[PDB]
């Protein structure tokens, strides 16, 4: 995911929440290196004039563990997230829920 991680980090460069600095050290090291290795392919005729992305997808179905109210604690998520529980799960994807986990309300396995 060395491609558009950088877009969020230039959105704010978050604090200790999102990333750590040495990873950014690595990221710029690698992003420079691939180009200076591409050196000996096409750099006397490198491109003359967006589309290269790697890890964008946010719908890989995961398994949730709820940890909360045995009734349906309804929270910020797009679907009918009804029937939340204390020991149970109704499966969902990750786009609609990157919210509970940042609350540490819910868990994965």
């Amino acid at each position: 995911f060395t491609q558009h991680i950088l877009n969020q980090e230039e959105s704010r460069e978050p604090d200790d929440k999102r990333l750590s600095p040495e990873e950014t050290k690595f990221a710029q090291e690698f992003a420079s290196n691939v180009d200076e290795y591409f050196h000996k392919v096409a750099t006397q005729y490198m491109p003359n004039q967006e589309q290269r992305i790697v890890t964008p997808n946010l719908m890989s179905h995961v398994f949730l563990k709820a940890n909360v109210a045995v009734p349906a604690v309804i929270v910020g998520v797009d679907d009918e997230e009804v029937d939340m529980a204390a020991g149970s799960q109704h499966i969902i994807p990750y786009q609609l829920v990157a919210d509970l986990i940042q609350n540490n309300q819910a868990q994965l396995i």
């Binding site: 890989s60 179905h61 563990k65 679907d79 009804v82 020991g87 109704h90 969902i92």
Partner: protein, 171 residues
């Protein structure tokens, strides 16, 4: 997902045994451990009974959910369990293997338990396919965990979803 990765999870669980020593050249490690003196129980995790029983130091005994009778009535509860059944510690498919591997030099009834635990294992596993022969319409807000365990569910995890998302996108 591995045969041992989840033992770096599951093997941390606790049992209670009796060692044969006094306190060791060091008596106790600063932590939840209790003091070491022969002839009496002590409560431990499971990354030592491996190390201990074959180090020819002590005995070992199991928890209570390992028996015949409880694991002969839980199955007939499971038969009508249209959803799920009773769950003794929820990663009990691995403590059994790491117990019945070494321990049986002294443990009682070290086969018929294997019989019943597999007899529950298979029935619940075959249950966990028939979710799929009814799972319709991309229903990715409705599914089952209610008294499920973990050591079965890695036996599905990389097959279905990794493709299910980018496939049943259409609905």
């Amino acid at each position: 997902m591995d045969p041992s990765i989840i033992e770096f999870i599951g093997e941390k669980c606790m049992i209670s045994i009796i060692p044969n020593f006094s306190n060791e050249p060091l008596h106790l490690i600063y932590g939840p451990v209790g003091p070491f003196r022969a002839g009496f129980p002590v409560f431990v995790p499971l990354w030592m009974a491996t190390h201990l029983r074959k180090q020819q130091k002590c005995r070992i005994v199991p928890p209570e959910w390992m028996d015949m009778d409880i694991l002969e009535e839980i199955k007939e509860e499971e038969k009508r369990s249209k959803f799920f059944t009773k769950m003794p510690c929820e990663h009990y498919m691995v403590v059994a293997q790491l117990v019945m591997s070494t321990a049986p030099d002294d443990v009682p009834r070290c086969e018929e338990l294997r019989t019943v635990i597999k007899d529950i294992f298979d029935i619940r596993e075959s249950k966990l396919r028939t979710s799929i022969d009814a799972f319709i319409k991309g229903e990715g807000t409705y599914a089952k965990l209610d008294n499920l365990t973990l050591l079965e569910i890695h036996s599905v995890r990389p097959i279905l979803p990794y493709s299910l998302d980018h496939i049943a996108r259409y609905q």
